């Protein structure tokens, strides 16, 4: 397992525009199109980004292309954020994914909001974090995934993604 697989599991795949649990238009593997409430803006956004006239539906390969940049973008975001970096940098490789998994989902900003949690983690206080996280809205919105994620921070292993 690696981050890519992790997220494909968490985000699934969709070749057509759609709304995330946040109500935003997304497509592919959790590719956020636009915060705007307008199909068109998204459609616009999409084409722009895709380069050609999409008409709201992408190709598998495109999805993959976005995915790959989005992932890249997140790693990059973290490494550039004063609050995340240090944390990220203090985590073992498995936990780093989780962090990323988070960032990819709520964004650098959202994630930098989990102050204590961040600290806790940084400080190896696994359970406490496990706990804290569970208190977020996300948790009640993506219980399934927040679980998997939390387990990963907690355990430091991919068991949550292994199919037991």
From Swiss-Prot:
InterPro entries in UniProt: Endolysin_T4_type, Glyco_hydro_24, Lysozyme-like_dom_sf, Lysozyme_dom_sf, Phage_lysozyme-like, T4-type_lysozyme
Effect of residue 11 to N: Loss of 84% of enzymatic activity
UniProt keyword terms in alphabetical order: Antimicrobial, Bacteriolytic enzyme, Cytolysis, Glycosidase, Host cell lysis by virus, Host cytoplasm, Hydrolase, Viral release from host cell
Variant or mutagenesis effect after changing residue 20 to C: Nearly no effet on specific enzymatic activity
EC main group: hydrolase
Mutation effect (residue 11 to Q): Complete loss of activity
Alphabetized GO MF terms: lysozyme activity
pH-related activity note: Optimum pH is 7.3.
Phenotypic consequence of residue 117 to V: 50-fold decrease in enzymatic activity
Enzyme Commission numbers on file: 3.2.1.17
Induction note: Expressed late in the viral replication.
Record-listed substrate binding positions: 32, 104, 117, 132
GO cellular component, one term: host cell cytoplasm
Task of the protein: Endolysin with lysozyme activity that degrades host peptidoglycans and participates with the holin and spanin proteins in the sequential events which lead to the programmed host cell lysis releasing the mature viral particles. Once the holin has permeabilized the host cell membrane, the endolysin can reach the periplasm and break down the peptidoglycan layer.
Name the UniProt record assigns to this protein: Endolysin
Gene responsible for this protein: E
């Amino acid at each position: 397992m690696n981050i890519f697989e992790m997220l494909r599991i968490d985000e699934g795949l969709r070749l057509k525009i759609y709304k995330d649990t946040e109500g935003y238009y997304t497509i592919g593997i959790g590719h956020l199109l636009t915060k705007s409430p307008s199909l068109n803006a998204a459609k616009s956004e999409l084409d722009k980004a895709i380069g050609r006239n999409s008409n709201g539906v992408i190709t598998k390969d495109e999805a993959e292309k976005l995915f790959n940049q989005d992932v890249d973008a997140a790693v990059r975001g973290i490494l550039r954020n004063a609050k995340l970096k240090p944390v990220y940098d203090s985590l073992d490789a498995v936990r780093r994914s989780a962090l990323i998994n988070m960032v990819f989902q709520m964004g650098e900003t959202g994630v930098a909001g989990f102050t204590n949690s961040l600290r806790m983690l940084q400080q190896k206080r696994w359970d406490e974090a496990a706990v804290n996280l569970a208190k977020s809205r996300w948790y009640n919105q993506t219980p399934n995934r927040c679980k998997r994620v939390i387990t990963t921070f907690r355990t430091g292993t991919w068991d949550a993604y292994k199919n037991l």
